[PDB]
Amino acid sequence: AALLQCTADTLADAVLITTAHAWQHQGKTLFISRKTYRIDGSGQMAITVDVEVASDTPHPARIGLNCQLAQVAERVNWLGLGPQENYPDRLTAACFDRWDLPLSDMYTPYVFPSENGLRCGTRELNYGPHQWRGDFQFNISRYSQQQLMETSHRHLLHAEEGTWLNIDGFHMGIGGDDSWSPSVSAEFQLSAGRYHYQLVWCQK
Amino acid sequence: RRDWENPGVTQLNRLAAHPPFASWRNSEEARTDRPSQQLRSLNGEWRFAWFPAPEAVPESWLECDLPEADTVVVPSNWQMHGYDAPIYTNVTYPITVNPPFVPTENPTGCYSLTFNVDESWLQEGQTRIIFDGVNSAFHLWCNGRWVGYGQDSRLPSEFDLSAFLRAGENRLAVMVLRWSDGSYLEDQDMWRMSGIFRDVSLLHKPTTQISDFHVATRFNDDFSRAVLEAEVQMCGELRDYLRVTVSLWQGETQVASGTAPFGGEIIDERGGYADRVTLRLNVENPKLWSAEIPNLYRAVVELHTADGTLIEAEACDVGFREVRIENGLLLLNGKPLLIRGVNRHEHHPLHGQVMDEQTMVQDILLMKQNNFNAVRCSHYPNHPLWYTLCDRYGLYVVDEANIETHGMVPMNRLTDDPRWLPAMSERVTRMVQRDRNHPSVIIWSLGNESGHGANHDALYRWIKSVDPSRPVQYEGGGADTTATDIICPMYARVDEDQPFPAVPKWSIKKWLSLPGETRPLILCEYAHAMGNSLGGFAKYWQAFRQYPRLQGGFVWDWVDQSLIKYDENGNPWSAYGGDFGDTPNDRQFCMNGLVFADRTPHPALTEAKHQQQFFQFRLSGQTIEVTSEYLFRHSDNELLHWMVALDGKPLASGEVPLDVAPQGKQLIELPELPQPESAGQLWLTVRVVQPNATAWSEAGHISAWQQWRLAENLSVTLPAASHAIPHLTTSEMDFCIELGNKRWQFNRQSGFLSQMWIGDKKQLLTPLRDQFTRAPLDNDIAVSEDPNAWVERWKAAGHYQAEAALLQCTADTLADAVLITTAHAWQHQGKTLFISRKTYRIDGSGQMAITVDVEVASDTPHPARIGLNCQLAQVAERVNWLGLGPQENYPDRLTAACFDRWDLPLSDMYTPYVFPSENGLRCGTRELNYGPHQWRGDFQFNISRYSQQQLMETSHRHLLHAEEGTWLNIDGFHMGIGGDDSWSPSVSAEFQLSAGRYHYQLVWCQK
Ligand SMILES: [Mg+2]
Ligand SMILES: [Mg+2]
Ligand SMILES: [Mg+2]
Ligand SMILES: [Mg+2]
Ligand code: NA
Ligand code: NA
Ligand code: NA
Ligand code: NA
Ligand code: NA
Known about the structure:
This is part of a larger assembly, with two copies of chain A.
Chain A: E1 2-10, E2 14-25, E3 28-40, E4 45-53, E5 62-69, E6 75-82, E7 95-102, E8 119-127, E9 130-141, H1 145-150, E10 163-171, E11 194-203
Antiparallel strand pairs in A: 1-2, 2-3, 3-4, 4-11, 5-10, 6-7, 6-8, 8-9, 9-10, 9-11
InterPro entries (chain B): B-gal_small/dom_5, Bact_Beta-galactosidase, Beta-gal/glucu_dom_sf, Gal_mutarotase_sf_dom, Galactose-bd-like_sf, GH-type_carb-bd, Glyco_hydro_2, Glyco_hydro_2_AS
Family (chain B): Belongs to the glycosyl hydrolase 2 family.
Keywords (chain B): Glycosidase, Hydrolase, Magnesium, Manganese, Metal-binding, Sodium
């Protein structure tokens, strides 16, 4: 990520931070992310994200944010599709309601590790002291995407410090018509070029 | 006798039906299709008088001209002359349903003509009169003596006048009835008119004559050899010295010739036809006929004596081609056709139902120029010349019997009734006898919308028996009955089933594979082009190309059936149903074409041309792959032009010759495409151009095109920050922003940007506000004569009455700009429909960025659009934009459009549909310029002098008046237009605005 712009403005009842980043490769700009963080007198932080994706780069796996929380909590409570893991092209069975499970249930122990445990169509997510609200997809677990990608067998995974949270405005389908050629239907590829999403982070 | 109220009497004294004759007395003339001195036209000025019923006609008229009559041209429709009104009714019969009776008040047209006949015609031979088209029934007298009677308004009626004429002057008197029992079989959805509306002619034949001739062409397995078989029948005295010579020519070269005395092979225990003979001619390596290459030969049939004296000659154009269905596919010369068809009624805005050569040629050339290859004669045999033009220009034709009984209840009431078998039988048999030698006719149709009755089955078998050379189709009763060789539904959808009881309309893909089904499927009508329509056209084409047995269809339909009327000041205007005092009527349902009545194209015509292209393209790297869809010709009049542009900025271009065999492929490698000067999206556009003129096109014609996005270099450079900062002024009433010469005013009570000024000039007539509705299209309205209609739903939900409520309006000053935030709710009867949240950020550069986030209640019908609108104070000459174009395009009808920089006069941004509605949208626009304004983003827009309100309140385009200023509609999202049909919801799910939450962003700045 290359920083294009970062500013701070004071408002009547909030602080507004504006940012712009370019992701490049060998000189090619793959994606641009433009954001605004609005923190109000209420302690809520509204994040608005507008991303542009190069039409000539392969459609991305996801469009979201991630971070590693210091907290490690027992339960994960959310208002969205569940209770089990679900993805864009695999969520018909999931139902929209208020779910509450232990953190480890938010992990799917595929013998060969990979992205897993996403929950889509989520309007509110609760973990420890935090709450995120919007219209997103998310997974949460003690394993980073990096560890998942680097480990060949589930038994070798080790819990990292803290909790990794992946919150996506958009996520590609998983496919499966076959597992040896591209199999994700067009309608589930992130090819729109421009994407918008917004999240509200607060404590309480 | 009231012959006009008795289906058992369809004619009296009428001569047998037969192919086109001219009785040439010179063989060379016959070869070249020169006019014949023995076929005289009686077209021109006739005497006419109108009466309210046949009983009102004075006996005197039979022998003498009525002095009250007027002199009018024939052929004509009397309605077109103002004698009575034309009526526009779709399904309901125009007369009470009480077969076989008709009203007692029955408009009667009394035509007469005084004409000369030379002794020569009467000293020898036979003189007959031919009325190519009389609507709907008539009696004929000659020199005051009654001759005969006729029905079926769409086929010729011939009578022998030999015994009635005298040398010198003679007088014909024709009494034409508007309604008759034949009208029960003529319920087509079209204007109901009447009169002698096709040619009238006199033909002299010798006593010993050619009375019929049939031509067939049969082939070996690879079409390298053919046998032309010509069966000839004579009338008059059999004599051993008579002979028949049949000669075949290709241009000026004689290919073959054969002669024989009459006397056919033994047929049964009683012998053979002594009055017939069959000549058989071998033809090696025949040049085959197709719509791609309409190769034609000429067959000349001479009746003569052995000593060599010609008695008479007849002839026809011959197209060597085989039509057969095999293994589920319709084949032409052994290859599977892909029908790019259209239905076409005989309609002229000035002349009614009278056809003329110029209009016919104009229609065929526009058809060909737009990638059509076939036409359905909806729904009756056409004027004879149509077939000759189709044979010579090259179009596949569906010839259809003049039988439609749509208003009956149930639909097959008459067609299942044996008492109606005779009348129906003449409609089918006489069409076959007249048109069977035309190569352009590839399929016969039993009629249209008359249910499925036993009469149909009988007639289907009759045709199969007499003419095995062409498939027979019929859609009534469910589209797949025992009376059809082809599954030929009307308005069946691509993927969606419409499971109506008894006569469901399955998805076309599914229909082919129902249990036991094996026939090919070609829609007899599809893609209802009424008004702003043709949405989803591409979906049909994609399926036709993927599924072998989906062989295409006939779009409904070619031309709007609007008629010209004159205003109080004599200016012409386009009229429809009800505009003549006609009632009941079906209003605009008579206008469903791809072209306006004057032949100007509607915007949908380009979508059809593009989807109907004959070359398919794929890009891989720098490689363009061209595939030909032609079955018979090589691309011998085609070059490919390619162009690469950066945001409308031309980078490079080239030309490459195309040499693709039919069904073949060609790979073309594009040159090194060396780096673009700046950021943006590179676009590749390719066009197939015909460098040489043809019989149907001009040199330079473009026949196919396609685009792709190439590399994109996103802009990562920042804006050289403002030399200044805007200033905000707050007042209880408004939030005002000033920057140099500009000023923006936001009304605090309304929460909308209410005015803008450049220098001292106000820029707005009406404030910039959200808009969630559109002036309903014909498809939104959905009427063919439904509370599921989109319009109904919207109205019922209060979408057009909703009032905005202000939830919030605030101002904030940033380091370099002023930011206004608003939020509004649109409600109806307590219901919150939509919520619009926005931010307007005006910066040091003078640019106003508007961000809009809309929420749509999941339980209100999805809205027609999500955007903003305003009425600009200015009226500018041009509209310039970077987006799809140049013509009008909508979400589900934008494939033909191309992304480029377009610049048109304002007026072209308005599509004058007869029935006004939302129109002129242009999608995928990234930049729009008008006057001093520029708007940037990723939106759809329309711009015109007519507001949406006006368009939805106006019934006819001529009554529109330009408003002050310019109405701008800019949308983040717009619903598709639909059109699978125009009488039910037809907008596919993927084009409905059902996402709940929508976001869009606009930048408004000066130029
Ligand atoms: Mg009758
Ligand atoms: Mg002459
Ligand atoms: Mg006389
Ligand atoms: Mg009908
Ligand atoms: Na792994
Ligand atoms: Na096909
Ligand atoms: Na119609
Ligand atoms: Na060529
Ligand atoms: Na209207």
